[PDB]
Symmetry: C2
Subunit: 162 residues, 2 copies
């Protein structure tokens, strides 16, 4: 039923999970592992060491892997912050992690960053734990394989009478 396994990043690394989907892998990191709070892009004192470890793991992965850093927020009112929107907050957070991965030697041609804003929650925002997961950063690992597409195009050009 489940395709998520807890992941251990730093011999502590609490709350992180690895999910497999059919078109790739998603590493999910709760807010408090990267940032001082849910509402800023300011990094916390352990941020760097976590990302270094992820970057080492990434170095074992083949070259054609594309790595997408994805940001997410909860619905926390944005009045107290310098951001215009949830999308903007999540973009800046995703972008910072990407940049740190670059500093650690991950090739920029394999990296991008995304923002989902507040509308893909993992859980109810009824606890600190759940709030940290709703403000998570994700890392999606995939490829731009097109073998199946070339087969289809090939077959289509030969065998379509339309």
């Amino acid at each position: 039923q489940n395709t998520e396994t807890k992941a251990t990043i730093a011999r502590k690394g609490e709350g992180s999970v690895l999910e497999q989907i059919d078109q790739g892998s998603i590493l999910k990191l709760p807010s408090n592992l990267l940032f001082e709070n849910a509402t800023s892009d300011a990094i916390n004192q352990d941020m760097m060491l976590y990302i270094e470890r992820i970057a080492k793991i990434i170095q074992k992965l083949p070259k054609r892997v594309h790595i997408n850093v994805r940001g997410f927020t909860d619905d926390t009112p944005l009045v107290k912050t310098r951001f215009k929107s949830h999308y903007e907050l999540a973009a800046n957070r995703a972008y910072r992690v990407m940049k740190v991965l670059i500093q650690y030697g991950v090739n920029p041609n394999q990296l991008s960053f995304s923002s989902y804003g507040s509308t893909n929650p993992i859980a109810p925002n009824d606890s600190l734990e759940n709030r940290m997961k709703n403000n998570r950063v994700e890392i999606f690992f995939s490829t731009d394989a097109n073998d199946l597409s070339k087969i289809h195009s090939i077959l289509d050009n030969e065998f379509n009478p339309h």
Copy 2:
């Protein structure tokens, strides 16, 4: 996710279908074989097989081709075939054999049988029953990049 098909302007009926893990080329059995109980290929449609063979030869080794056989559910009584599974196996295999005749690498080919199990139509008519009698060719790859990515991540991260 499908359209009609032909070749050299002599082969209506055959459809190409795309599914997420590969492509399926449909060859109507009725055209393909002399009659509804034989594994003897229509010697007139060896030219459609050849075309398919020509395309396969363009595809790299990671692309595997599976020739699949399917039947209606008319009980077999006047025949030397002992089941629909066996009948479907022989038809798939005979089409496979002809691809091989036309130069296709035997190591990229296999044949399957589904018997009467997954009919395109309800079995009630030389209209409908003959829709169930078919041979499909499934094109896919042995790609495991995503599986390998997951394995490595899981090995490094999962306690």
